[PDB]
Write a protein that binds this ligand. Sequence first.
Ligand SMILES: Nc1ccn([C@H]2C[C@H](O)[C@@H](COP(=O)(O)NP(=O)(O)OP(=O)(O)O)O2)c(=O)n1
Ligand SMILES: [Mg+2]
Ligand SMILES: [Mg+2]
Ligand code: NA
Ligand code: NA
Length: 325
Amino acid sequence: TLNGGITDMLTELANFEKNVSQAIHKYNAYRKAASVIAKYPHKIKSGAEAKKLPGVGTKIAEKIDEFLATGKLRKLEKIRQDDTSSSINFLTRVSGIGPSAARKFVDEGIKTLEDLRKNEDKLNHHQRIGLKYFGDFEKRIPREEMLQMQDIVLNEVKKVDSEYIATVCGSFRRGAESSGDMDVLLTHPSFTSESTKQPKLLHQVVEQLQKVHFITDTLSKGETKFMGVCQLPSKNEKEYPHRRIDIRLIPKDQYYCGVLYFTGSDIFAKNMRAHALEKGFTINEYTIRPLGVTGVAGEPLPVDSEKDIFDYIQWKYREPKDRSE
DNA sequence: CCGACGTCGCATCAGC
DNA sequence: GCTGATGCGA
DNA sequence: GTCGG
Ligand SMILES: Nc1ccn([C@H]2C[C@H](O)[C@@H](COP(=O)(O)NP(=O)(O)OP(=O)(O)O)O2)c(=O)n1
Ligand SMILES: [Mg+2]
Ligand SMILES: [Mg+2]
Ligand code: NA
Ligand code: NA
């Protein structure tokens, strides 16, 4: 709320660069700037004040001035009144449609929800689903419902094998009063970095959730990542809207790196990996490795908590609550 | 003043 | 049926 | 767009 206008502005500008100009690094610059300002504990009162923050340069400082002085930004107005930019901006909000495809549709005269629906023959499976539940995916999820979903997921997982461990990551583990979707970290002793002894570990769980009709649709699926759709049973009351669900099977010994990645926030993670690079380290959802002078990563260093990974790169441990950067 | 910018999974594609 | 990338997403 | 460095 504090510098809400500025952050909203930069976020809107960011989406425009990602979705329309297809400049993902401008999009990341703008989102990093908004982040740096979101943590800035003062009401920013000039572009000069903002420029001193890392990630804010001249161009954003000038825009911050125009906004503080006028309450708007002409660039945003020009963008908002462009059909092309707006149609493109909008189509990207459908799951499966990004900058490239959204433009392909607009080039083809396809720009409305209605336009998409009479041209379903042009949508792959993913895009088809994201369109079917576009209205449902636009709603956020009460934590009260997340808990309901958590009991269901954790329980079905138990039934397949009692040695499975399921953990609801994402914004939920960050204690958010509501969430965009459900992210589940999953482990099993059979699957480590040192071997895969059992086949179809993710698959079994997906089928179990499907056979009991928790999971309804499937965007994409692999041996370690499931991306789909699920729904709380309503009693018949109105139907709960469908929700996105991601499941990520991480090798059990690499759990702490996995839960670190999967908990977020996204721009927390980016800045953290950016920092690790400033220390001769590199991090993914699996490991933390020391960068060789040659660029090539050395062996995975031992890790036994999210904190361990913080220590390696000299950073104060921060509970999930404070990672929503 | 240029170049790099987190790091990966899944579906697919241009070259072999 | 691989590598290396695009595209989209986490 | 920013900063590295
Ligand atoms: N670009 C990205 C996107 C997601 N992620 C990681 C951190 C995210 O918290 C985690 C799950 O992504 P997510 O479900 O899209 N967003 P998240 O759970 O943080 O908040 P919601 O908007 O879903 O409530 O994936 C990332 O590391 N880099
Ligand atoms: Mg989430
Ligand atoms: Mg998710
Ligand atoms: Na700066
Ligand atoms: Na999209």
